[PDB]
């Protein structure tokens, strides 16, 4: 009865394609808002239109574990591969699967060294899904069935 | 008898004068809880049998003959408890008071964030130990946690025999705190040290580490304070409140019977008098960030006092919010004079810029509105700002920045930028802070889209003079020449690149052109072709034989190039190519989508295209009937082009956001789909508590 | 700086001229919601109108003192003598005060039984003004100037 | 080897099923922090330095082969070891987990609403000292406090000699609080229930309380497990937190943490995957009350766990209102869509109902809509319900009744009344609750208006059938023969009489004419006004000919005697008298006022009248001119006869929320009125959104 979605993130190497860590789905925040210049801050003509719209995927995991290459070995760009498994209401364990992936992510993660004196371990690790101008965005979805 | 009572009372409260300051509360465990010291100022008469020697001192405190009547001896020794209790903030028994202030008062060099006099008292020679505590606390905070730790060694050698019971106790504790940073920090740069900067950073060496490792083993916190001597205890109860790891509970605990009490004071609709408990809330965190930072104690730096802080100021914040907007009743404001409204000062810069997030600084921002509190203290600010960014720029203007003081100071120095767009601010605070900002912040703790968003949080507050204008420019011609590798993209996590600050300077400034974008043009080759397309964005923000010379170079025959063409004026009406080009994009989509179907969908990114042809052809753009053929990728498409096939239940009311007020007007006067929108904003509206799509609503009465 | 207004909340006997305790006033909820047959259900004709609203006026003081002869000598009423300063904008500071009473008022607090560890030095007394027929609120407000 | 694995869980667990549950997070300290036990039973590997601590014990229970080559007691043992875990609800190794199963924990009767069963055993003969302590938490429970001190040193006593160390353990710390229990009541009782009743209740005697003040006094629990045999210590390290008297040190903490995380979340607008942060926090209440009760410890009273579990519930409440008002994003759907809703079974109920105060669940249904979710196990519920209506029948209806009971069960007994509002209800049930609400439930804490209200709720989702109109209508006569008296009179806090039951009787029943009534009427002469006033309240509800004798003996003659007349229905229009009456009415309160312009002015009572005429005149009811020359008397007065001259800064929320329906629909009606009606009601709602200023906004005025 627990939320079932235990979703395992595998975070490779985008350059070489070298697994770099893998980890249990926690958390995936999304933001749309018109933050660009001020509250309406945009350019526009009487005949022109352009949709200023920015958005934000934010994503958080839990306890990852990092590959022995990786650590061995040590513009970098890195790939996460979310792996769900589709539960529709009708049938709540689906064999079709759903594949989530993020090409493109930063390790930009808010921990910033947190030094409280507490004796838990959960490096939890966030994510910023970053762009460029051809893609607004990396994320990208698919279907099993 | 009035000697016997400041006998009494200097009996008790000599020991104490050796601290810095003592919290209000604690002072019940001096007297053994015969008054209850209430954090206000006064002293109400708790339980106890005595003489009432608090009365005979306050008479005394009253009356000039009572202490003329006394020994010489006991004169001095009134005038030091008078000299006390000024200091700490106690006044009265409660009866006797009528109206009490309240006022902060911190003042260690350390909460004003003064690194050049903390290095320089640092260097310059000490002459006993209370100088080298200072000394080491000031070290710890600078980063240089080796020769803090060394030091706080060297302090508990020498105090252990010099009887210095609290420097000893103090230094315990800060030695155990500092040595639990440097460990967390060395495991936070072996595994993941790598993951975030790239590189082994190691500034800690194996042999010091293993030193630290062997050195304070199996040294329990919670059985320091028993270990230290019996008149040690017996006469600084006060403390035993810092020997456990887990201390801060009970204020955690007491913050949440107060967070509860006040809800439901907000929820009833009550009228509180006399101390609210708001009050108490602030008046405990400020004493205890006055306590921690004057005493000098590295716990101070832990995640555990970050939140207990934020929790507070959050909810000083959200109550003096609700508090803005009551029922009137005609009753609550006639009992006291004018009203004790919310007002923002230095200390509480500080204390928010320090002890929060970002993420958690919008939280506060999007519950309340910040903006309507007013804010003092403006010149003081200014100068935290100031020095904040002079500290940055002479770090960043060399190569040698601690990396442990980079991880602990660049969040502080986050959060007060972003914060300082309600503060005012001077000209030349100004040009620094934007400077600064654009020039020095490092690129890999703040990238582009952050560093547009957070210039033009400061530009909203303070209007753009011709510096600003001239440093951005510098910093945008210094973007443009690293554009010559053949090999520099960029990466905007919230999607905004250099060309949306070439937009803020053309917008504060309708008429500017830089000519040393003209020149590096003029000098622009084919072979660079990363750099025509760079420096093509910023179009208006060239000359015109620059102008000239681009468009010579390459046309704008491409998907993104229309766009881009689009967003900075290059083209204003979609010629028959251009027409064509979108329809040949939309029939590769389709067949796109045609294979998917059979592969699994996906679909975030050519949907946004999508999303802007069926709003173009909405708004009697796009003239062509092919687009109603290539209806089928169900994302707002059909939605703008065939509204009354579309079925609305698969409308998101979220997609109203996005839209403009030319947008929303159309939308409206369009009869085929009104009902059905402003039906699902108005039971969305009465559901949810969002006020833009109260709004949107407002927009939609009709 | 704070509330400078202190309130004096004297709690009297009715039926003599004796007063039962003093304490320290600290908060009032007025309360005033149509809950006579739920929202709809009153009493309705073409030409008719009554106004069916309810109102209650709940009080909660603290630091309450008892009388010693109260205890000594122990349908009853008690009466509440509220006593502020009446503090305006313009004069922050008034040598007018502002007199709140509770004639009818019926002695009631939830704290009753409450069984904290650390015995609490809080006893918060709730107090209700109860109604009559003739008289729909009982609560009075006079200024001596 | 296997036997190797066995034996070593064996010897953990061995002393650990004398607790009959033990909450799963305090299984780490068992293995000294070796692995971290989830609440979903999932056990995650923290630390460890060997093989087959536990993961050796699940692969043997999922291969019955391995269980198979231990030995005859290797195989009893892990037997055992099985069943222990499956109660416990741990499950496989985390590394090895599945779909995890999450439902409310099993309890006792203690915990659930049964007082007849709890008497038949305490009746019976005792067979262990598990049965002696059992008793003696029911005794405790059922008001005997002094009979459960007794019990619990007697098994003091018992255990000591019998050397069961956790029975010793919990019976000091029970019957610690016990005392605490008793000296607080007794306090409290001499405070304030002399002022409540008259003449304070003296339940405990006086030497009793000197006798338990002497027994034990200077002795705190924050101790006691120091003193207890090492052995007991290193086995049973889970109950070393029960000893400190500041309890619930740690839970409020992590309490605190989540909801600050749970808030976050709802502001963010962020999905979770696994375990949410509400299902942990479902999961460590459940396990708290579990363990708190099932083992039947006596500090489920105090008012520490009572606000513990009334912060839990109000936030699995508030958010689940949250997903049921969150709007999804197909991207949020792709990751999960149709979640399930928030189901309020019985033990839902059961704590709600325990463990709030009644302000705290107004607070709740202010906040959320709990009308909107669906309810469970409606049979369990009715049951509890009757159990509850049952035992205060048969508690009043006879003499006998103990007041510290009383003060420890109608708190429970009026919140689980005022929260079956929503629980559908059996007819028999249905009887027994009303009657058990209108004829012995004591005037001491329930007057005449809750009960009322409390009546109405009830009828809300059930309705009355004809037994209940015939309970109601024995009420009414009731109160009739109590009238007799010239004392009696009739109060209510509320402000809702004994009219208000007879217009539900009527509207319930188009016709239902009481004969007894009628007959109590023909039995009323001159000398019994006062009968006769109250028989004219409920006037309809009697027979013809007693309303003929009624007209026969009084009519109207005052404000007071017009106000009732039109209010039920006797008078439809305002004859001249009557209007003549109201004259001279506002001609004496004018006359009051201009004397009372020296003094401060009040309007409480008159306000009322002066706002009715004041309806009437805008109505068009009443034609006479001269009430147009009292303007200026009540801002409302004027605001309803005059609104044009009136100045509309005098608006109050009380009046902008509190609105009327036809009144609300005439001053639509009126431009001048709506103007600034409409502009003050947007405002407000724009500051606030409250539902209530929403309604009128979105229904009546536009």
Redesign the interface.
Same mark, same amino acid.
């Given at each position: 009865?627990?939320?079932?979605?235990?979703?395992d993130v595998y975070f490779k190497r985008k350059s070489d394609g070298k697994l770099?860590?893998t980890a249990?789905?926690?958390?995936?925040?999304?933001?749309?808002?018109?933050?660009?210049? /001020?509250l309406? $801050? $945009?350019?526009? &003509?009487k005949?022109?239109?352009? *949709?200023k719209?920015? /958005?934000?995927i =934010?994503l958080t995991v839990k =306890?990852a574990f990092?590959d022995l290459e990786w *650590?061995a070995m040590?513009?970098?760009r890195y790939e996460v591969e979310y792996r769900?498994i589709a +539960? =529709?209401?009708d049938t709540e364990?689906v064999y079709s699967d759903? +594949?989530?992936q993020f090409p493109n992510v930063?390790?930009? $993660?808010?921990?910033?060294?947190?030094?409280? &004196?507490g &004796?838990a *371990?959960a490096?939890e690790?966030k994510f910023?899904? *970053?762009?460029?101008?051809?893609?607004?965005?990396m994320?990208?979805?698919?279907?099993?069935? | 008898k009035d000697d016997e009572v400041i006998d009494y009372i200097y009996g008790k409260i000599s020991p104490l004068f050796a601290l810095q300051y003592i919290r209000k509360i604690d002072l019940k465990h001096v007297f053994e809880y015969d008054y209850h010291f209430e954090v206000n100022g006064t002293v109400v008469r708790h339980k106890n049998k005595g003489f009432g020697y608090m009365e005979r001192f306050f008479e005394l405190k009253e009356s000039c003959d009572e202490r003329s009547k006394l020994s010489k001896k006991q004169y001095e020794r009134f005038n030091a408890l008078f000299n006390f209790f000024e200091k700490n903030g106690v006044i009265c028994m409660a009866k006797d008071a009528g109206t009490l202030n309240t006022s902060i008062e911190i003042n260690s060099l350390a909460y004003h964030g003064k690194y050049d006099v903390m290095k320089k008292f640092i260097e310059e020679q000490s002459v006993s130990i209370e100088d080298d505590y200072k000394k080491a606390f000031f070290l710890a905070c600078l980063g240089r946690w080796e020769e803090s730790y060394d030091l706080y060694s060297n302090i508990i050698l020498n105090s252990i025999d010099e009887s210095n019971g609290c420097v000893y106790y103090l230094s315990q504790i800060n030695r155990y705190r500092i040595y639990?940073?440097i460990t967390? #920090?060395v495991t936070?740069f072996n595994?993941?040290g790598?993951?975030?900067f790239?590189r082994?950073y190691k500034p800690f060496t194996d042999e010091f580490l293993a030193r630290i490792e062997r050195e304070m083993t199996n040294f329990n916190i919670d059985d320091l304070f028993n270990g230290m001597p019996f008149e040690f205890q017996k006469k600084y109860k006060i403390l035993e409140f810092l020997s456990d !790891?887990?201390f801060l509970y009970d204020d955690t605990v007491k913050l949440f019977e107060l967070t509860n009490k006040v809800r439901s004071e907000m929820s009833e609709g009550s009228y509180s008098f006399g101390m609210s408990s708001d009050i108490v809330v602030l008046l405990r965190l400020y004493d205890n960030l006055r306590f921690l930072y004057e005493n000098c104690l590295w716990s101070v730096?832990?995640?555990?006092f970050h939140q207990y802080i934020r929790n507070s100021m959050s909810l000083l914040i959200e109550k003096a919010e609700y508090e803005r907007t009551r029922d009137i009743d005609e009753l609550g404001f006639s009992f006291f004079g004018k009203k004790s409204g919310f007002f923002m000062e230095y200390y509480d810069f500080v204390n928010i810029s320090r002890h929060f997030?970002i993420?958690d600084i919008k939280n506060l921002e999007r519950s309340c509105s910040i903006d309507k509190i007013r804010f003092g203290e403006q010149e003081k600010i200014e100068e935290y700002l100031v020095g904040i960014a002079e500290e940055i720029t002479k770090q960043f203007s060399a190569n040698g920045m601690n990396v442990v003081f980079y991880?602990?100071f660049?969040?502080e120095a986050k959060a007060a930028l972003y914060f300082a767009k309600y503060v005012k601010l001077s000209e030349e605070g100004l040009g620094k802070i934007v400077k600064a900002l654009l020039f020095y912040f490092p690129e890999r703790d703040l990238?582009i889209?952050k560093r547009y968003?957070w210039l033009?949080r400061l530009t909203?507050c303070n209007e753009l003079p011709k510096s600003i204008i001239s440093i951005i420019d510098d910093f945008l011609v210094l973007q443009a020449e690293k554009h010559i590798d053949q090999?520099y993209?960029?990466?905007?996590?919230?999607?905004?690149?250099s060309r949306?600050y070439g #937009?803020?300077i053309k917008?504060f400034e309708k008429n500017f052109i830089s000519k040393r974008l003209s020149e590096i043009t003029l000098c622009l080759t084919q072979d660079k072709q990363k750099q025509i397309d760079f420096l093509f964005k910023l179009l208006p923000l060239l000359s015109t034989n620059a102008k000239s010379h681009l468009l010579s170079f390459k046309s704008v025959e491409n998907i !993104?190039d229309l766009?881009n063409g689009?967003?900075?004026?290059l083209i204003?009406?979609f010629t028959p190519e251009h027409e064509e080009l979108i329809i040949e994009y939309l029939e590769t989509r389709k067949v796109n989508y045609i294979v998917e179907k059979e592969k699994?969908?996906?679909?975030?990114?050519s949907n946004?295209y999508m999303?802007?042809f069926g709003?173009?052809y909405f708004?009697e753009?796009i003239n062509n009937s092919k687009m109603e053929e290539f209806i089928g990728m169900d994302d707002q498409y059909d939605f703008f082009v065939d509204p009354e096939n579309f079925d609305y239940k698969k409308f998101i009311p979220?997609w109203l956001? !996005?839209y403009?007020?030319?947008?929303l007007g159309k939308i409206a006067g369009n009869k085929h789909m009104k009902h059905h929108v402003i039906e699902v904003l108005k039971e969305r509206v009465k559901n949810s508590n969002d006020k833009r799509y109260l709004e949107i609503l407002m927009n939609y009465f009709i």
């Open positions: 009865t627990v939320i079932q979605d235990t979703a770099v860590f249990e789905a926690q958390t995936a925040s999304f933001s749309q808002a018109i933050s660009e210049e /001020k309406r $801050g $945009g350019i526009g &003509n005949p022109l239109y352009i *949709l719209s920015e /958005k934000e =934010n =306890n990092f *650590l040590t513009s970098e769900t +539960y =529709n209401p364990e759903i +594949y989530i930063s390790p930009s $993660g808010e921990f910033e060294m947190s030094l409280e &004196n &004796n *371990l490096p690790i910023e899904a *970053l762009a460029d101008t051809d893609t607004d965005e994320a990208v979805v698919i279907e099993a069935s | 639990q940073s967390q #920090a936070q595994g993941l790598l993951l975030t790239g082994h !790891n887990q730096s832990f995640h555990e997030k993420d991880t602990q660049i969040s990238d889209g968003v033009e909203k090999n993209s960029e990466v905007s996590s919230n999607g905004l690149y949306d #937009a803020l917008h !993104n766009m689009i967003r900075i004026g204003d009406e699994g969908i996906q679909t975030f990114s946004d999303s802007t709003i173009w708004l753009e979220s956001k !996005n403009n007020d030319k947008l």
